[PDB]
Design a protein around this ligand. Structure first.
Ligand SMILES: *[C@@]1(O)[C@@H](COP(=O)(O)OP(=O)(O)OP(=O)(O)O)O[C@@H](n2cnc3c(=O)[nH]c(N)nc32)[C@@H]1O
Ligand SMILES: [Mg+2]
Ligand SMILES: [Zn+2]
Ligand SMILES: [Zn+2]
Ligand SMILES: [Zn+2]
Lengths: 50, 76, 122, 99, 49, 39, 166, 98, 97, 55, 86
RNA sequence: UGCU
């Protein structure tokens, strides 16, 4: 994303099992790296590196 | 006894979801929650305390099965 | 919900009486309000079957007496249905074995009836 | 837009929204901000238990108007939903049974 | 493999919208195709007779 | 297959659905059987 | 009375985990098979015992505990020749309405075999003189659901003499 | 007194067996025969004709007019098929190569 | 529906399904694509494998082998369209155990 | 009438793009959800007049 | 143009042609009688194997009286392969 | 037709 008018979708699960699976498997803290090569994608960005 | 002793993230998620669903359906609590109104938080506390009464039944592709307890497995 | 065998093994009225008494005592010891309210037909059927068995002479029976009666009848080459009916009825008169009991022809012999009466009364 | 591709593999669902994004560094990486307007519309079905009974009672007492609250209640015996905007919310909260 | 009977589906597959604003309704193509098939069958029967 | 699982609306065999879970309930396998007196 | 083997998949809700599994299974089986007639089996009275009870699964759906339990239950099913003792719970012109003691009002004895003085004039008259005995003859069962009872049986009363009561 | 019948079973589909139906099986599956080519009646209500296309005995497509086969609304009606006989057989374009 | 003016919901397209499959959240994918979108309960006859109504199979004129089953409404529509196309899907049900 | 209280105060109130006929006394939801068409569905339904459909 | 039909055609449409009556004669009568005799006598033939009854209720003294007895033909095991011996 |  680039914060220039992007419309993003937000979904709310309707089941406790689905909620737990989303929190565990799709957790942000657990998906800090990509499976392609293991490089971290969630890191510093512009206005933070500088 | 031949599979990995570590408990995978998929097993963690499934056990937590099942326990949260059971608790939301008025299941007994074995950790004495302290003002936790979230069934998922209660399930996570029970997992950390190693008191979830669930046994994973791992099936091999050929057809064999093996039982592994939550307290017996290793968590991260 | 399929059944494997509807005629697995026949049982006398004493076993049913004992099972009903055990169920009744367990119910009165561990009664649950919601479980009872969900299905009240269980209580009615158990109570009425117990009352019927109490009306019958099935009382004053024990497994030792049942085994003794079975061993006594084993020497009379009588069939399982006949001995089951005799144990369930406890006939005190001779006519109940002469006419009411089936397969009377060639089986009475007019001498074994006294032994049958003595065994069923003892 | 066929049955296999437009109705089976990819299909539309409810309890979801679409909104523009804006930056906010004051929130954690695992946290996301949701507006009150979308929050009041997107609801979650929570089962009444021995743990969150008081929280659900307070939410029902608040009602659909105040942000912390609920919109509908489905009884355990009958599946007839009840709208909190009408009726005595205090009575509905006082008559919350488990399940 | 050779068909002698056609299975007309239920109305759930053939949605019909009653457009009260005009003297007509919105019907799917399957309904029109089945109507044409029935008309052709009737015409064939008439020609045979 | 995953595609037909999704189409039919059943949990796919891959992911968390590869294994099954059991309940650690207080029980007693093969409970004592009531002896038969007549047989 | 006879034992019947059955295999049932009993579902126990999560709020019954504090109870013993075997006791809960027995209670559920009793509640499910109380005063119900199984086709080609007979009317089940109650549960006798439980023989085999395998592992307890939990499905990803309802989330309850489903157990496949093998058990034996008592059912009332005569062997086409059993002798019973019932009570006359009414009488009809075509045949008397006898019923076993508080058990079931389904016994319909046909009056076509007694001595040739058989008739019912609707005044509850049993039979003209020269605890009622019954001899089962055949069984019969039928279905109930046939659109978007089931046990009557045949009863016989031959010339038993009945020195106690005519 | 009461017969034992199971209320609901946790049935899970095992596999789908594809196949074909003979004209007799099609007739058995169908409920009515559609022979009228018209859709609605001559009256100003424009009600659907009987034994014709858009008949309510083969399901429902309106929230006001329920199904005639089963007394349920649109949300609960699953729909019913119908059979239309052809004077002369025709090749099935799907099975023409077969 | 599709558009927001007609009160339309978001679409979990093929890419979203692929992402969910890669994550392995089977229960989440099920709840999204079956429970919360097109959940429905149909009646299937265990004898002929056809779809019934109100617990009744008009094909066999019986109701003993008919049982309820959860199925997406889109899948039911696909089955009906295939049956119309003479491609009859015969569903052989079995216990979940 | 309301299935719970029997009242006839049934009002059609749409709650956040959700048509719902609900009782005004106890709030019991009588009916909810309406089946519309969608635009591509609307486009693919062809306009046929009564002059042809009626007969 | 063809007219529209309100009701479907009859399930059994009438026909103005009727089947020709059967041939009469002593030969046809004798053939009919012989076919009936064959139908009556072939069911009791040992080759007519019936469904083996199972699930007996109980055993009784009248079992020997009600026991069905019928002679059984002995197949030629020389001509028949060995895979059919009991 | 517009949007990233
Ligand atoms: C635009 O000039 C034309 C071109 O549209 P097409 O892409 O040729 O329409 P289509 O081929 O039929 O696309 P599809 O198969 O996906 O439906 O048409 C007008 N126009 C097309 N599409 C839109 C649209 O989505 N929104 C608006 N406002 N106009 C559209 C344009 O004039
Ligand atoms: Mg951008
Ligand atoms: Zn219908
Ligand atoms: Zn069928
Ligand atoms: Zn009301």
């Amino acid at each position: 994303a680039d914060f220039d008018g992007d419309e993003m979708n937000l979904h709310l699960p309707q089941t406790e099992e689905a909620k737990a699976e989303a929190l565990v498997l799709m957790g942000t803290k657990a998906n800090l790296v990509t499976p392609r090569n293991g490089e971290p994608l969630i890191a510093a960005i512009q206005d933070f590196l500088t | 006894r031949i599979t990995t002793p570590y408990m995978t993230k998929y097993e963690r998620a499934r056990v937590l979801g099942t326990r949260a669903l059971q608790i939301a359906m008025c299941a007994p609590v074995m950790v004495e929650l302290e003002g936790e109104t979230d069934p998922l938080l209660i399930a996570m506390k029970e997992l950390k305390a190693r008191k979830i009464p669930i046994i994973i039944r791992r099936y091999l592709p050929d057809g064999s099965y093996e039982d592994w307890g939550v307290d017996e497995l290793i968590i991260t | 919900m399929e059944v494997k065998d509807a005629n697995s093994a026949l049982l006398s009225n004493y076993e049913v009486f004992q099972l009903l008494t055990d169920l009744k005592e367990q119910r009165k010891e561990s009664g649950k309000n919601k479980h009872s309210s969900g299905q009240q037909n269980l209580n009615t059927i158990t109570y009425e079957t117990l009352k019927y068995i109490s009306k019958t002479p099935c009382r004053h029976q024990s497994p030792e007496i049942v085994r003794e009666f079975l061993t006594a009848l084993k020497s009379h080459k009588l069939t399982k249905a006949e001995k089951l009916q005799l144990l369930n009825h406890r006939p005190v008169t001779a006519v109940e074995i002469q006419l009411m009991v089936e397969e009377s022809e060639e089986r009475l012999t007019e001498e074994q009836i006294e032994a049958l009466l003595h065994t069923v009364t003892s | 837009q066929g049955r296999f591709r437009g109705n089976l593999s990819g299909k539309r669902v409810d309890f979801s929204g679409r909104t523009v994004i804006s930056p906010d560094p004051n929130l954690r990486i695992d946290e996301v901000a949701v507006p009150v307007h979308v929050a009041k519309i997107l609801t979650f079905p929570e089962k009444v238990n021995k743990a969150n009974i008081n929280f659900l009672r307070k939410l029902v007492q608040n009602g659909p108007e105040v942000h912390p609250g609920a919109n509908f209640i489905q009884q355990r015996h009958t599946q007839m939903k009840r709208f909190l905007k009408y009726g005595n919310r205090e009575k509905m909260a006082q008559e919350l049974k488990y399940g | 493999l050779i068909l002698t009977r056609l299975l007309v589906p239920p109305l759930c597959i053939r949605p019909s919208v009653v457009s009260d604003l005009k003297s007509g309704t919105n019907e799917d193509d399957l309904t029109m195709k089945l109507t044409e098939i029935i008309f052709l069958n009737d015409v064939i029967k008439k020609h045979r007779i | 297959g995953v595609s037909e699982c999704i189409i039919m609306g059943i949990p796919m065999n891959i992911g968390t659905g590869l294994f099954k879970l059991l309940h650690k309930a207080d029980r007693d396998p093969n409970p004592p059987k009531r002896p038969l007196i007549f047989d | 009375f006879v034992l019947v083997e059955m295999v049932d998949t009993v579902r126990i809700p999560p709020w019954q985990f504090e109870r013993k599994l075997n006791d809960s299974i027995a209670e559920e089986l009793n509640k499910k098979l109380a005063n119900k007639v199984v086709y080609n089996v007979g009317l089940c009275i109650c549960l006798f015992d439980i023989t085999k009870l395998e592992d307890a699964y939990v499905f990803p759906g309802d989330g309850a505990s489903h157990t496949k339990v093998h058990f034996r239950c008592v059912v009332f099913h005569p062997f086409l020749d059993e002798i019973l003792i019932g009570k006359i719970k009414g009488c009809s012109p075509e045949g008397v309405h006898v019923s076993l003691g508080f058990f079931d009002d389904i016994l319909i004895p046909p009056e076509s075999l007694q001595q040739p003085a058989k008739f019912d004039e609707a005044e509850q008259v049993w039979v003209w003189e020269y605890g009622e005995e019954i001899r089962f003859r055949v069984v019969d069962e039928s279905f109930v659901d046939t659109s978007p009872y089931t046990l009557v049986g045949s009863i016989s009363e031959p010339g038993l003499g009945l020195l106690s009561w005519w | 007194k009461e017969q034992f019948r199971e209320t609901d079973v946790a049935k899970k589909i095992s596999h789908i067996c594809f196949g074909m139906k003979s004209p007799e099986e099609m007739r058995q599956q169908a409920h009515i025969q559609v022979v009228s080519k018209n859709l609605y009646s001559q009256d100003n209500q424009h009600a659907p004709l009987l034994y014709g296309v858009l008949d309510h005995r083969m399901g429902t497509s309106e929230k006001d007019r329920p199904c005639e086969t089963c007394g349920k609304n649109l949300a609960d009606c699953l729909g019913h098929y119908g059979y239309i006989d052809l004077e002369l057989p025709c090749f099935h374009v799907g099975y023409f190569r077969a | 529906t599709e558009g927001r003016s007609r009160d339309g919901g978001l679409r979990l397209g093929e890419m979203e399904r692929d992402c969910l499959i890669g994550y392995g959240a089977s229960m989440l994918l099920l709840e999204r694509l079956m429970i919360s979108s097109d959940a429905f309960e149909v009646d299937v006859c265990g004898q002929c494998g056809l779809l019934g109504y109100s617990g009744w199979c008009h094909y066999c004129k019986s109701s003993c082998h008919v049982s309820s089953l959860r199925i997406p409404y889109a899948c039911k529509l696909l089955f009906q369209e295939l049956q119309s196309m003479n491609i009859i899907p015969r569903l052989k049900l079995s216990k979940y155990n | 009438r309301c299935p719970d209280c029997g009242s006839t105060e049934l009002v059609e109130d749409s709650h956040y793009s959700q048509s719902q006929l609900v009782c005004s006394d106890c709030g019991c939801v009588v009916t909810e959800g309406v089946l519309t068409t969608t635009f591509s569905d609307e486009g693919n339904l062809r306009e046929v007049t009564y002059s042809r459909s009626t007969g | 143009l063809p007219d529209v039909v309100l009701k479907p055609p009859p399930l059994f449409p009438d026909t103005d042609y009727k089947p020709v009556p059967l041939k009469t004669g002593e030969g046809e009568e004798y053939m009919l009688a012989l076919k009936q005799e064959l139908r009556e006598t072939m069911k009791r033939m040992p080759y007519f194997i019936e469904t083996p009854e199972e699930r007996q209720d109980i055993e009784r003294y009248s079992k020997r009286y009600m026991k069905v007895y019928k002679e059984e033909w002995i197949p030629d095991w020389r001509r028949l392969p060995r895979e059919m011996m009991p």
